[PDB]
Amino acid sequence: EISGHIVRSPMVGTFYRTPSPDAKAFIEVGQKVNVGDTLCIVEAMKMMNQIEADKSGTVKAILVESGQPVEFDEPLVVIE
Numbered sequence: 587e588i589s590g591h592i593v594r595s596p597m598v599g600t601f602y603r604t605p606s607p608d609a610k611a612f613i614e615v616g617q618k619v620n621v622g623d624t625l626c627i628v629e630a631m632k633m634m635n636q637i638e639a640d641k642s643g644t645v646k647a648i649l650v651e652s653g654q655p656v657e658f659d660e661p662l663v664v665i666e
């Protein structure tokens with residue numbers, strides 16, 4: 587059985603769950619995202635790699651661990 591969809595970081599940077607401290611937190615666990623919705627930023631050299639969920643579904647968890655540097659092909663967020 588498939589485990590949904592997993593999003594692996596395309597490059598290296600810095601994962602996160604809550605951008606601008608004065609925000610509403612990005613797509614965290616138990617969250618709902620639809621093809622066309624935001625996801626999160628990578629923060630690679632100040633590029634704001636703000637990804638946008640394009641597979642719809644409900645986030646299951648994160649393996650990259652926000653606040654931690656990102657690496658090529660890193661499960662940023664796994665959707666259910």
Ligand SMILES: *C(=O)CCCC[C@@H]1SC[C@@H]2NC(=O)N[C@@H]21
Binds near residue numbers: 602607632
């Ligand atoms: C880049 O100019 C310096 C670091 C910027 C950090 C960014 S702002 C939105 C995210 N939230 C946070 O705490 N850090 C990320």
